[PDB]
Amino acid sequence: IVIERPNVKWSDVAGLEGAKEALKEAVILPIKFPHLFTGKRTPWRGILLFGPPGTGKSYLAKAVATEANNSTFFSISSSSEKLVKNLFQLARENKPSIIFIDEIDSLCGSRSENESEAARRIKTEFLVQMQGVGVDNDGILVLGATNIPWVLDSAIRRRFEKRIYIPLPEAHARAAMFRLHLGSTQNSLTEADFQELGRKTDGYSGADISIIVRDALMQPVRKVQSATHFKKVRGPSRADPNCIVNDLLTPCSPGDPGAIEMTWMDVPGDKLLEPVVSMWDMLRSLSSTKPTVNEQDLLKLKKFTEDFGQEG
Ligand SMILES: Nc1ncnc2c1ncn2[C@@H]1O[C@H](COP(=O)(O)OP(=O)(O)O)[C@@H](O)[C@H]1O
């Protein structure tokens, strides 16, 4: 449904050097330098991003969605469904355009034979759109995401000539994801800290880490809400940062010199000085969270890789 353009720069996507290049070569260059991809170099029709969950598929998708030079981006997902015909339409009308279908593994059921009457109808609607009588020769590419690609139907799988794997982040990659998600928020983690976190999250996916930071990140909020005492520290003016004040209030332990008796209720709106997210927090946040992506994922996944190679 969403017909937007996001703001996820390659920089934000950590790791995935090759995915990045592979996607530049098949999506961005053909757009910028059309004369280069004519004749025998017509870019592939559909790319299929696949691999363990939370490794970057959807995310990376938005990356190309931003790096698409005004080349309108269309995104749909698992959700009278002739609206498929309708999607490709506005797409051809606005070429060059991209189509991203998250978790394409939706329309299928190649395990326990999950079968529906008209879902067999929904598939073929699009399964036909791939060629089109009125050739969509246009600069239109179809992106497909999936964490369970083997359950895919050869019918669709084989309309994606170029397929890309999206792996579990390596060390350096993790570290950056910690710094990235932390964003520009007040904290106190040193480089050596990120690297140490990177080393600790061995085997975690990118979504796992994001789930971690989003938690630790909320640590200074809890401390402020659940506090019982507040010191009276000195720090930047809430209304004008470059003007220190010796007036701000910050939550602190009852057993601390300068500890006033009162909760956030009393703390004025513009005198609150929040704590900085710390390494002790991220670690506590890391502990109560364990990697989900087990070897089966890569196991039944390694299969698809070998037994299907390209041409799907
Ligand atoms: N390689 C990555 N770089 C930065 N963030 C990532 C990466 N992979 C996953 N994430 C995080 O997880 C989310 C995207 O998950 P995707 O949508 O990548 O999961 P799927 O890959 O869809 O399971 C984003 O919100 C992002 O914060």
From Swiss-Prot:
- Compartments (UniProt record): Late endosome membrane
For the modification Phosphoserine, which residues carry it? 278
Q: Predominant location of this chain? A: membrane
Q: Describe its partners and assembly state.
A: Proposed to be monomeric or homodimeric in nucleotide-free form and to oligomerize upon binding to ATP to form two stacked hexameric or heptameric rings with a central pore through which ESCRT-III substrates are translocated in an ATP-dependent manner. In vitro, associates on the inside of a helical tubular structure formed by a CHMP2A-CHMP3 polymer. Interacts with CHMP1A, CHMP1B, CHMP4B and CHMP6. Interacts with CHMP2A. Interacts with VPS4A; the interaction suggests a heteromeric assembly with VPS4A. Interacts with VTA1.
What this protein is reported to do is described as: Involved in late steps of the endosomal multivesicular bodies (MVB) pathway. Recognizes membrane-associated ESCRT-III assemblies and catalyzes their disassembly, possibly in combination with membrane fission. Redistributes the ESCRT-III components to the cytoplasm for further rounds of MVB sorting. MVBs contain intraluminal vesicles (ILVs) that are generated by invagination and scission from the limiting membrane of the endosome and mostly are delivered to lysosomes enabling degradation of membrane proteins, such as stimulated growth factor receptors, lysosomal enzymes and lipids.
Q: Which UniProt keyword terms apply here?
A: ATP-binding, Cell cycle, Cell division, Coiled coil, Endosome, Hydrolase, Membrane, Nucleotide-binding, Phosphoprotein, Protein transport, Transport
**What organism, scientifically named, is this protein from?**
Mus musculus (Mouse)
Classification lineage: Eukaryota, Metazoa, Chordata, Craniata, Vertebrata
Q: Which tissues is this protein detected in according to the database?
A: High level expression seen in the kidney. It is also expressed in the heart, brain, spleen, lung, liver, skeletal muscle, and testis.
An annotated GO cellular component: late endosome membrane
- Using the UniProt record, name the top-level EC class of this enzyme in a single word: hydrolase
Q: What's the protein's topology in the membrane?
A: Peripheral membrane protein
Which EC numbers does the record give? 3.6.4.6
Q: Which residues bind ATP?
A: 51-58
A single Gene Ontology biological process assigned to it is: membrane fission
One GO molecular-function entry: protein homodimerization activity
Q: Which reaction does it catalyse?
A: ATP + H2O = ADP + phosphate + H(+)
Indicate the family of this protein. Belongs to the AAA ATPase family.
Entry's free-text remark on domains:
The MIT domain serves as an adapter for ESCRT-III proteins. It forms an asymmetric three-helix bundle that binds amphipathic MIM (MIT interacting motif) helices along the groove between MIT helices 2 and 3 present in a subset of ESCRT-III proteins thus establishing the canonical MIM-MIT interaction. In an extended conformation along the groove between helices 1 and 3, also binds to a type-2 MIT interacting motif (MIM2).
Protein name according to UniProt? Vacuolar protein sorting-associated protein 4B
